[PDB]
């Protein structure tokens, strides 16, 4: 399985499918080192949209396939979220989580809307809050003010980081 | 290099002649400031406890200093936070400190400290701001940390705060080159007017600009 919404750009980076980044290295060094944490492997980003952040993500993935990733994570692999929908919807999105938790070998980057939704709220957020499953978020604070914060335990789950326009 | 060297005394030891790289005059105050912030170490005062009332005009370096301070101290001036006492009236305490119904908003410079725990805080003819703020000003003076509307209490000692006064604009007529001790006293009570000393008593020291 681990397909459809489940996808990765790391091989794609080893496939050279994407762009060598610059300058967010030590920025990524943080984002990288977020995974180190028994507490929170899981960073989130703030900043200006469309600026390269999901490539900054890929920057990790490069540095991953570059093995600029140090040890523990080197086995693990990017997952780039896919967003879409189809009776219920999220249960799928709920479902994949054990799969990747079953994967023992990867990481996902949650992308932008980390959502306070109508149909929602805690979705993976407990399995997030399960204290497992290394993952990454990003947004600008304007959203960040809410979901990660209004819990604050997802704040206790998430590590915020932001970088200015280069 | 500063990241490299910063031994934890190179500033201090040189801090005057360090600071002297910037603005002539108030060398003493400069020294005092240097003297002051050294007490920002050693913890001989309250380790949770940086408070400076500028007596001076435009062009007085009030900005410069404060700027250069962390620009010297924290190796950048963006640690600084402008805060307009003109904008301090009655209810901004919320917009100082998180509301939570009354959106939920708090800190013009806080969330920035929530952003930036090592910082500098500028206030403006500060007594211009209301007896409203003096207590939440006192909050800073309180405990040397900063509570929030969500309650979060955060260290001031890891930042700086700045107070400015033109109060002696008249009394500046003295150093407009007279002995400041006149105007020092003469402004002291004058600002001492505006503040219960306890306010003034957590000050590092009052800062003339002559």
């Amino acid at each position: 399985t681990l397909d459809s919404l489940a996808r990765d750009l790391t091989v794609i980076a080893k496939d050279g499918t994407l762009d060598p980044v610059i300058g967010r290295d030590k920025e990524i060094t943080r984002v990288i080192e977020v995974l180190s944490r028994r507490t929170k492997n899981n960073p989130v980003l703030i900043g200006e949209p469309g600026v390269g952040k999901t490539a900054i993500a890929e920057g990790l993935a490069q540095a991953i396939v570059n093995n600029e990733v140090p040890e523990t994570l080197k086995d693990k692999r990017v997952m780039s979220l896919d967003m879409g929908t189809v009776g219920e919807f999220e249960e799928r999105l709920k479902k994949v989580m054990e799969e990747i938790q079953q994967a023992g070998n990867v990481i996902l980057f949650i992308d932008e809307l980390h959502t306070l939704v109508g149909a929602a709220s805690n979705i993976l957020k407990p399995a997030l809050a399960r204290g497992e499953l290394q993952c990454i978020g990003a947004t600008t604070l304007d959203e960040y003010r809410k979901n990660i914060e209004k819990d604050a335990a997802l704040e206790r789950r998430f590590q915020p980081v932001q970088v200015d326009e280069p | 290099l500063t990241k490299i060297n910063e031994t934890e005394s190179e500033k201090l030891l040189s801090l005057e002649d360090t600071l002297h790289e910037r603005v002539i005059g108030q060398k003493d105050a400069v020294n005092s400031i240097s003297k002051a912030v050294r007490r920002a170490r050693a913890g001989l005062k309250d380790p949770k406890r940086g408070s400076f009332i500028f007596l001076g005009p435009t062009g007085v370096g009030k900005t410069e200093l404060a700027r250069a301070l962390a620009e010297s101290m924290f190796g950048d001036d963006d640690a600084m936070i402008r805060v307009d006492m003109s904008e301090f009236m009655e209810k901004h305490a919320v917009s100082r400190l998180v509301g939570a119904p009354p959106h939920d908003d708090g800190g013009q410079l806080t969330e920035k400290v929530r952003r930036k725990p090592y910082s500098v805080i500028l206030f403006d003819e500060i007594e211009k701001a209301h007896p409203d703020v003096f207590n939440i000003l006192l909050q800073v003076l309180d405990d040397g940390h900063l509570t929030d509307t969500k309650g979060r209490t955060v260290d001031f000692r890891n930042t700086i705060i700045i107070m400015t006064s033109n109060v002696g604009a008249q009394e500046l007529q003295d150093q407009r080159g007279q002995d400041y001790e006149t105007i020092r006293k003469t402004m002291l009570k004058e600002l001492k007017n505006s503040f219960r000393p306890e306010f003034l008593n957590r000050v590092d020291d009052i800062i003339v600009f002559h």
Partner: protein
């Protein structure tokens, strides 16, 4: 208590170093224990130490993981740098 933490950290001392292939120096161990308790509100020294630790254990490994020989974790930087990486003014 900060101290019991050290012990419970000493509990996991072998743990993540045998994960991170490093040598924990209790100097560090007690260090952050104070230091985190000092500097970190949110997570708990029962963890946040180890947080720092493993993160330090990473940062070393990171350096040690790839291009920067010490396998042991220093007291200071492991605390300090990381903790400075946490905050500043080492």
């Amino acid at each position: 208590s900060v101290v019991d933490t050290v012990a419970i950290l000493k509990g996991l001392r072998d743990r993540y170093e045998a994960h991170h292939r490093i040598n924990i120096s209790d100097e560090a161990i007690e260090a952050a224990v104070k230091l985190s308790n000092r500097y970190v509100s949110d997570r708990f020294l029962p963890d946040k130490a180890i947080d720092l630790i493993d993160e330090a254990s990473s940062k070393v490994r990171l350096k040690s993981h790839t291009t920067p020989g010490m396998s042991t974790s220093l007291s200071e930087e492991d605390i300090a740098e990381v903790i400075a990486g946490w905050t500043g003014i080492p």
